[PDB]
Amino acid sequence: MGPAFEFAVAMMKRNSSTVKTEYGEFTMLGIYDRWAVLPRHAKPGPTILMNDQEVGVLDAKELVDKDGTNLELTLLKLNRNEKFRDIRGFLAKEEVEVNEAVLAINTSKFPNMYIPVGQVTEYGFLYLGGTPTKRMLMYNFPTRAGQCGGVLMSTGKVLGIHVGGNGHQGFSAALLKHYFN
Amino acid sequence: MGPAFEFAVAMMKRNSSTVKTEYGEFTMLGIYDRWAVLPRHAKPGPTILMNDQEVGVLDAKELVDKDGTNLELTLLKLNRNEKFRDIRGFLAKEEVEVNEAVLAINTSKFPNMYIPVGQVTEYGFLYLGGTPTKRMLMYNFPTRAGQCGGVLMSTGKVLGIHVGGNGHQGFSAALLKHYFN
């Protein structure tokens, strides 16, 4: 757990920010160039607050698979004049399973907070508030809204983005390499 | 940070609980026998909720030093028929300084959450919402109420209980061995 925590703290310091949209406060992970990811429920508009500063949003893509099935992730391209540190090498080609993971949250209601979640398994297909959803990872998680956007990590690996839970398990959308570019 | 996180997760699983008083929700650390500690602001009454169960409170002591100066801690004796795992050996004789510490919170608004806080230094005397207070430890902490009661730890050491902050630093009451018995 300790190596996953050290990895997570470092990665959050380099690549995460706190984002506010009209729909709430969320942890955001920058991925490369000006592309970041949010849980789909964030619903970014043409401007967001990133670390309390207004930033224009140039594009937003709600991800679905080849057959239009919801993946619960929104990729957003930001009008800034810095690049994110490229972390695409930490993203897997396919859904990651691990024995020990940390969920990291970076918001006002949770500033720079880390939760050990234990084993992550590939759950796959699920209904998310009525909507069929694919590529879900599952882990133990006594369950709150507000963690939405949290970044699921293990040593050397960024696994996914926390998108909800049922009270006893939490669910992340797997964050896959091919989503980028 | 990693060893301090592994230590903190273990210690929280064995010795912490979530407490509700009429004044709010707090992380509580059981120390030995039926004695636990809360930040003074918790103001426990004759019953508390411990992990959502009612538990009688047999005694509560607001700690002050030899000259009546506030230490911002309340020790409480609980009417339960289990003992806490004795962790008095993890409590120092005098205020602890460390290079790397974790603050651990166990509540609804923060369930089983860990924050790396870096260096802890002995601050000593301070005014806490108007009240002169002694034996304060200080660390970096972009600052929220609700962390009150959080347990400050490093590898093999329980340092104190988080009792407030100023926006950039957080403050714990040092949790000293001699407070017990």
For the residues of A91-106, what is the DSSP string, one character each? B-SS---EEEEEEEE-
* CA–CA dist B171, B125 (Å, integer): 11
CA A42 to chain CA mean position, Å: 11
Query: Can you give the resolution of this entry in Å?
Result: 1.9
Q: Which residue of B has its CA nearest to A8?
A: B2
Question: Active-site positions of A?
Answer: 41, 72, 148
Which of A7, A18, A113 is the best mutation test for B, with the most CBs of B within 10 A?
A113
Distances (CA, A) of A50 to A84, A94, B68, B156: 13, 29, 46, 37
User: Fold identical between A1-15+85-181 and A16-84?
Assistant: yes
Is the separation of the CB atoms in A96 and A174 below 8 Å?
Answer: yes
Structure-token pair, residue B161: 């209980």
Name which of B116, B87, B81 is nearest B11 in CA terms. Answer: B87
Structural domain boundaries in chain B: 1-15+85-181, 16-84
Q: What torsion, rounded to 10 degrees, do the Cα atoms B47, B49, B50, B53 define?
A: 100
Alpha helices in B16-146 (DSSP H): none
Which of B110, B140, B147 is the best mutation test for A, with the most CBs of A within 10 A?
B110
Structure-token pair, residue A60: 């937003």
Q: Which residue of A has its CA nearest to B114?
A: A114
DSSP-derived letter for residue A84 is B
Q: Is A2 in the B-facing interface, judged by CB distances under 8 Å?
A: yes
User: What's the gap in Å between the CA of A18 and the closest CA on chain B?
Assistant: 13
* CA–CA dist B173, B159 (Å, integer): 8
DSSP-derived letter for residue A108 is S
Half-sphere exposure of B49 (CA within 13 A, CB side): 13
Domain B1-15+85-181 has CATH 3.40.50.300: no
User: What's the gap in Å between the CA of A115 and the closest CA on chain B?
Assistant: 5
Q: What torsion, rounded to 10 degrees, do the Cα atoms B24, B26, B30, B35 define?
A: -30
Q: A115 and B113 in contact by Cβ < 8 A? A: yes
Name which of A2, A8, A38, A1 is nearest A20 in CA terms. Answer: A38
DSSP lists the bridge partners of residue B120 as: B98
The CATH number assigned to the domain with range A16-84 reads 2.40.10.10
Phi, psi values for residue A89, rounded to 5°: -60, -20
Is the separation of the CB atoms in B89 and B83 below 8 Å?
Answer: no
Q: Which residue of B has its CA nearest to A107?
A: B142
The technique is X-ray
Say whether A68 sits in a helix, a strand or coil.
coil
Distances (CA, A) of A122 to A16, A96, B50, B79, B115: 24, 7, 34, 44, 27
Using CB atoms, pick whichever of A9, A105, A116 lies closest to residue B116. Answer: A9
Strands B113-128 and A35-39: unpaired
Distances (CA, A) of B137 to A177, B46, B49, B149, B169: 44, 30, 28, 14, 10
* CA–CA dist B17, B10 (Å, integer): 13
Q: A108 and B3 in contact by Cβ < 8 A? A: no
| Residue type, position A46, single letter | P
Distances (CA, A) of B55 to A150, B31, B63, B80: 34, 16, 22, 7
Q: Is A1 in the B-facing interface, judged by CB distances under 8 Å?
A: yes
